[PDB]
Amino acid sequence: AGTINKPKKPTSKRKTTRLRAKISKRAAEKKRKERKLARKNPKDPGIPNLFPYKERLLQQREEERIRRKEEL
Amino acid sequence: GSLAFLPRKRAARHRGRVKSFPKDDPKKPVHLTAAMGYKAGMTTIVRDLDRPGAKAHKKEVVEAVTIIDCPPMVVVGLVGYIETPRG
Amino acid sequence: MGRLQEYQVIGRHLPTEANPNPALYRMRIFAPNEVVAKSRFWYFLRGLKKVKKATGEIVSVNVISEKHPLKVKNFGIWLRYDSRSGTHNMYKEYRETSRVAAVEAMYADMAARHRARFRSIHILKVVELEKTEDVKRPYIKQLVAKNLSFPLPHRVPKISTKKIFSAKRPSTFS
Amino acid sequence: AEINVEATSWRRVEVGRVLKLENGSLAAIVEIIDHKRVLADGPSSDPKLATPRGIVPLSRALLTPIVIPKLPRGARTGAVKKAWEAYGVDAKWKETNWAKKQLQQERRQSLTDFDRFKVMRLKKQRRFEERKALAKI
Amino acid sequence: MRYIHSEETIPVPENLKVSIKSRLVTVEGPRGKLQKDLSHIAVNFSVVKKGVIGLEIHHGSRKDVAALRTVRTIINNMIIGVTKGFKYKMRYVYAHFPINVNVEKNAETGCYEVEIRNFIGEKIVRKVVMAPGVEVEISKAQKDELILSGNSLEAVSQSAADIQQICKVRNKDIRKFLDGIYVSEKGNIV
Amino acid sequence: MSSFESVVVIDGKGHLLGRLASIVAKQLLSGQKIVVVRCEALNISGEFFRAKLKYHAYLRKMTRYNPTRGGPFHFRAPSRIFYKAVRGMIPHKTARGAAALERLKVFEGVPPPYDKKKKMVVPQALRVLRLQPGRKYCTVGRLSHEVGWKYQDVVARLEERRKAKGAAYYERKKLAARQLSEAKKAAAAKVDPKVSEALAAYGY
Amino acid sequence: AKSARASRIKENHQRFKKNIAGPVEAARLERLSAKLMAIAQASGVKSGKSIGRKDSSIVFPM
Amino acid sequence: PSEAGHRLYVKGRHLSYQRGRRNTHPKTSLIKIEGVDDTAAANFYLGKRVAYVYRAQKEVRGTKIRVIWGKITRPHGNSGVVRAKFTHPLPARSFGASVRIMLYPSSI
RNA sequence: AACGCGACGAUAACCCGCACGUAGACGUAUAAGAAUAGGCUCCGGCCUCGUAUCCUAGCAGGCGAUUCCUCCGCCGGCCUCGAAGUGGCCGUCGGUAAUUCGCGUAUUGCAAAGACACGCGCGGGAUCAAAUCCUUUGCAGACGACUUAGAUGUG
Questions:
Q1: How far is Cα E31 from Cα E82, in angstroms, rounded to an integer?
Q2: Which InterPro entries does the entry link to (chain G) (predicted)?
Q3: Strand I: which positions are within 7 A of a protein CB?
């Protein structure tokens, strides 16, 4: 709107050190919470289609499975 | 009061300054702009008003006027001004 | 990372009286020097199999150089990168003269375009498109096209940074 | 239907265009890699004009008027050498205004202290005639 | 994606003379003079055939290629205006108060002035000034219709848009009061 | 190439505001006299409304009791806008900083003692060598005019008269180059060709 | 009400200044200039025609 | 008449002392020689005699000119600035003053 | 703007005495404008590049030649320069290696107080041209400050 002609009071971008202390305290407390939540407890995407020699990889892994059953 | 006239400051000089003269174009002919005079007092007049749409149309109206005594000026000099990027 | 090289790292589990002559694994690793190539070998191998550095040994490390680092090849890199959501596949293509120049441009691309770091990128397969018409990206196909020739508009002159003032204004037509 | 335009006629970079590098050397383009990098090879007999086969960046190169007519793409050192000798690009580089400038500025730095004094003396002798002719004109 | 090359084509007919100094393109034809400056976009102008202008961008983004398509039709519109011309037929309709239109060509500055009276009975005269290069005449073929003619499409369309805006009804329902001047036909002279 | 000059005069046309100011401030503190000319033709990057936003935010900052003392004096001239940029890069509270600001001179337009001199250019702050071609830029002169400068038409009329005098000077300069080439070719016939052979080998 | 600096009021004033009060001030100023006229009419370096010199904070002192 | 100069020195300016942010050491002084832009060009000027001439407002030896002598010791940075040591450290007010670099002692 | 600037009016030349001679010169040389997806030009051509162009020899730059009409400076004369004001042309006079010489330079040792002339000021007095105090004024005033007036008159 009229911010070019009448700009408002700017939001200061310098962090006070008492605000920086609260952020580091609050972030490390959340890090404790996820580690406590993970302690509480209760997929390969495959070869991309756009790969040019994708057909040869399936044939190479078929022959690899040929060698696996021959060894075992 | 009005902030346009504040702070209350004495006039630096007793005479008075024009400050702004009218904008000039060369199409009109030559004419002077300002003049002095000396104030003498005030008096009353009656003017036959010629104002269409007013209640006082075509009837006598008393009016307060001022009288400024102006003896003829004498031209003694000519100053010329050049236009600089500092004014 | 810097002057990357490509190393062939051969490793195996430590031999045992019950299991003599172990499996002797091999991996191709893009690493700046030898000591991280050995470190990245044992990082991946302990992820796939049970073998670890304390119970294994490095059989050989050999660098591999390009067959022809003076010919221009189109390379296709399949990679798997980890983001804040999960693991995704990409097939990117680059035009270089070497395989280490392929992954050097890859790490700069993934860092610039997707903010990916070295420990999140998994180089799955790097292939050289031996024949054209297997190039499938529009930017590389644009360079492969017939009788290619472009001008160089707005080339700034190389004026020395300690030459503070100059008399004549520069031109941008060379 | 008369049309007359005046735009910039940039030097086309292409297969066969020979470019001057910052060390005073020359190399002809064999294959275009990207819009910033290119593959070049200057097989000159003159060691000051030689350049090994390798990737040069276009930022550190500079385009010369000479172009080899029918250079194939991907030509090896043998084919580029035979094209350099046939077209004689060492001869036409010497005739270029850039090499005359480079030759003159190399004669600047070779001037010894005695040689710079003879330069001052002979320019004084030369300008005595040029001042005389200018007063005549 | 940094497209290496993209080009476009502007055909030029036989009775034209186009000239491009740096980006200042001027088209001279049977109908007159046209001229415009395109230094705000990086276009390489060339001639590639007998009567074909070429316009190319080198190492451009999508917005650099898309800027060639808008400047293709602007120059082509300059070609059309200097060959065929542009005509805008506006028509003014009224319910009760008959709107009066008077057009006079002013001696200084050479601009037609269209003055409008009796727009829903308002006593204000509405004087709108045409752009330099467009001519306004009362049509005699059809009733209550104005014809604006000229070479510059931007000038004739802005002059037509200025007439429509100045006779705009205010503080009144637009479903009941249909008085105004509206563009009806929009094409060429020939 | 790191030259030392008595007074170096810089043409401000086509120059970025802060990148010219940081070069000038480093030169002023090194001991170099700087005269900046055509401050209205300087360029600021970004778009025009951003510069118009930034000055109106600057115009928002004033002292409460009286703006005559202690208030930020908002200067509407292009030269003082450039002077504000240079002063922020200078420790002006110290005596070394104030001596460096005394070595600076800034003018709107090209005043008569400085149109006879050779105006140099700074390639590290030129807009055509630094800004990307698609990006937008503004001009300090149109920033200053729409915020309070009242001498734009004065400067434009004075610049117009300087071009006319400059155009006539270039015709005389063109003629002097004609006569020098005609004299050089004519004097070369009687120039003792043992001299010209040695000068050609020496570079001259 | 409409402000004294409104755009419509300015345009109405501009039509008054051009059409109504325009020629009236022109005719009055013609009569005043005619009166000032009646009162008024009632080598170059040696004649002063060529302008020479009579009888520095812009350049640094050399 | 000769109409020539008598300059046997290379011009230089006194930039500052050797310093970090908030710690200055006046024993060593940074000199910008006219024409040097690199460490390779600065290497020619190492171990050259350096003079800082100034004026007195009092004649002491029949002259008003006092000189402080020093030598260029090692290069500084990448831009060709050298750092020099003088018998007495240069004042502070001379930040930006002219400094003469002599061509002796010579290995040419 | 009382530490921003301009135009103008009128001034302070005498005589007597006496106190001292660089916020950074060292060739402190260089005017087109304009574009930078273009421009300059002898209309032949040229442009990455100021790595350019002028000047630069002589006891810190002597003396006398041979020889040269080139460059520099001062006065005028006529014109030009006003954004915070200068150059051009002509004429006089002074100087002037573009070529070639002759007689000096030293023992200050390998780098680190005499005479004359000219300015800037101080301390007296005398000669100007003003301002302030003084007396009046009341268009002004907390007090300063301000508007007037006082030398012969239209007081």
A1: 5
A2: DUF2423
A3: 4-5, 7-8, 21-39, 41-42, 46-58, 60-62, 69-71, 77-86, 95-96, 98-99, 113, 139, 141, 146-148
